[PDB]
């Protein structure tokens, strides 16, 4: 029993601006500000990876992920943790882990983009059917926006490390 | 014989919020709560009624243990919840059952304080009109009679002797239609989404 | 031998805020504040005050246990209150009178606070009024519009309806337990 | 022989930050910071020095045990603050005492940064005052030169705050709740 | 035999901050987040920091003990940082040493982003001058003072001396104790 330990945070302005601007693009200025995207991400990630946790511990062959505020009573940063057999290989599994929740958390948040960006479109394909005219040809130029951006599947990041996985020196007390 | 089972919650996503949204902006628009809200007041709402039920459980004749408790220590959201039993699906039953039963239950509470909402706008804005068009024909026989004071431009003032009111007072008339026709559906109304649904548990708690 | 009740309080509902937060918009309009923020302070007040009695109640040579903590940890509300005593039926009675006592308690000094504004505005209201009255005759020789707001404003001071029976700074989520069992010894 | 006090306290109430307060609006108008912001702003400081004395006193060669801590775990305010001592009514006097050190020197710190914005928003709106002049009567001047070959309030606004000298002794940093108690136990080890 | 140093940490004052809030103040001028934000985010990257280093000090072959925790638990700030040495004195200064050693290192990384964002404010600005002297000749090829203060301040931009030393992430409530007695098992 070796225990590999990462500090983790919000992504930062970087990575989140891709998927920003699509919802500034979208949403004019009812588009969310940056700092709650952030927020919102890391938000998603600690609550899908402590259901990883709950899930890991609920099988056979037990393992012990753990997720909790790095200085108690702070939101951010957030400190997780793993244990398995080997030193190595709790530092290289607790990766893979962190990352499986990130991709699969961040898989979901594309489809609600991949999604809102033909949600609305009923919105600017239904000004073309309210015509067939001033400040109605600005519809025609946020549609060519909303056609300019394309929300690759590598683009979103939900977390961003402050300190990664650690190599245990010293084996776990029993 | 004791197996708890758990569960994680969060707060509704603004889909199964947005019947209640709506509503709440019809009937207010402007000062109307933001959906961010709104789904915070939620869950909110359930997460209180749930310590309730565990409180009144633990204090059955036949003791029960039902918990919540925040997953992260310290974070706001998820919720997690867990309840322990005498078989292991008796537990994962149970659990999802108590959760369905504290939605439900404050879903309804929600549904009566909007048609409460619905009764205390329409009051006022009846009342409004009541007053808006009780002197608006008043200073209008006012205006009808203090020209009728006849004689300072003479001959003229026999012309001066039909209503249309302001855009103001015709978006108000057009919104009252909206909200004394707005349809509450109880089964739409949710207030809690899972991260995790109730867990089958593999091995057996003791102490 | 030990019993211990319980009840689970929250902020007062909206409606039960109602008179008292219009009471500030007659009194203030835009630095009037928000309901939530109306009821946020006066769960405050409650827990603060519900706080206090319980050191005190511990202070006592004839020791009680009265105790106050958020029912979720490290959740706002709601929050359960609890009272131990000699028996189940005397432990839920005393509770409940203590959460009332509490409540009445603040709700008077809140009360207290609201009345010393309506007679403290029907005198900062003269001096903006009956001072504009005189000083336009002076430039009569050497009338506002400002001067018709503050009638207004003065006239909705005093249709204030404000009986110490409008503040209540709590509201149950469960009254307090009847306990089937008493305290592990 | 060990006696523990305690008082409850709270942030300070709007009354006893008017000053403050009114001082804040004077030099910036509506992007002060709320009266609420300030009131916070207020117990925090008292909290963040109490809990510093707190550990001083905690190193001395003669130990003393004084502690703050939320009322109610979980909550903001109030807090609750407690002081252990020789004799029970010793401890009440020392908590007070304690308690009206900490008030105090805070007030001082709050006094000095009431100067030091004075001091640095003079120095902004006077550099702004003469910016806009000396760069728009250089554009009054390149009117005329074309023609050849409520900033008012800024300066009312200066005057306010020439005329905004503040007292020490108004500034108070907590409110009681409780005041410190008398212990009629005494502490079990 | 192990011994305790305690300092009493907050967000770093106006003052300490001053040097770099200009600066943003400069090159986003009205979207510059306000001093209270940068106050805050700077103890915030202080604290983020200070618990790697705590992390990898555990891990080291002699372990070694450091702690940041909030003073009053459940309250944002102040933080109480801690460090266990061998002798009392020893102890003191190498917490000091250690508090200097992240200051110093979020420091530096906020000179390499405000670098970072200098680069782009410059390269954004070119890039709109670039079309402003594509208009500017258009100005009189078919024959504002507004836009002739954009290029007035990207020299402000130019311009700005911010060297990593004048740069604080914390401030002391508390400098690190000298320990009377020794700890105990």
């Given at each position: 029993?070796?225990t590999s330990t990462a500090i983790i945070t919000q992504p930062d302005?970087?990575?989140?601006?891709?998927?920003?601007?699509?919802?500034?693009?979208?949403?004019?200025?009812?588009?969310?500000?940056?700092?709650?995207?952030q927020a919102?991400?890391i938000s998603?990630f600690s609550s899908?990876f402590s259901?990883?946790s709950?899930?890991?511990?609920?099988?056979?062959?037990?393992?012990?992920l753990t997720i909790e505020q790095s200085v108690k009573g702070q939101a951010l940063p957030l400190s997780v943790s793993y244990?398995?057999?080997?030193?190595?290989?709790?530092?290289?599994?607790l990766?893979?882990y962190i990352?499986?929740v990130?991709?699969?958390?961040?898989?979901?948040?594309?489809?609600?983009?991949?999604?809102?960006?033909?949600?609305?479109?009923?919105?600017?394909?239904?000004?073309?059917?309210?015509?067939?005219?001033?400040?109605?040809?600005?519809?025609?130029?946020?549609?060519?926006?909303?056609?300019?951006?394309?929300?690759?599947?590598?683009?979103?990041?939900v977390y961003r490390y402050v300190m990664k996985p650690t190599?245990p020196?010293?084996?776990?007390?029993?």
């Amino acid at each position: 029993k070796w225990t590999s330990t990462a500090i983790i945070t919000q992504p930062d302005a970087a990575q989140v601006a891709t998927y920003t601007n699509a919802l500034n693009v979208l949403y004019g200025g009812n588009a969310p500000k940056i700092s709650e995207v952030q927020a919102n991400f890391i938000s998603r990630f600690s609550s899908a990876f402590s259901a990883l946790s709950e899930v890991l511990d609920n099988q056979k062959e037990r393992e012990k992920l753990t997720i909790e505020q790095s200085v108690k009573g702070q939101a951010l940063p957030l400190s997780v943790s793993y244990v398995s057999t080997t030193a190595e290989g709790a530092q290289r599994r607790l990766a893979e882990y962190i990352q499986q929740v990130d991709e699969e958390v961040a898989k979901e948040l594309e489809v609600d983009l991949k999604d809102n960006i033909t949600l609305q479109t009923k919105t600017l394909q239904e000004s073309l059917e309210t015509q067939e005219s001033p400040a109605y040809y600005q519809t025609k130029q946020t549609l060519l926006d909303i056609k300019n951006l394309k929300v690759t599947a590598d683009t979103v990041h939900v977390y961003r490390y402050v300190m990664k996985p650690t190599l245990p020196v010293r084996r776990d007390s029993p």
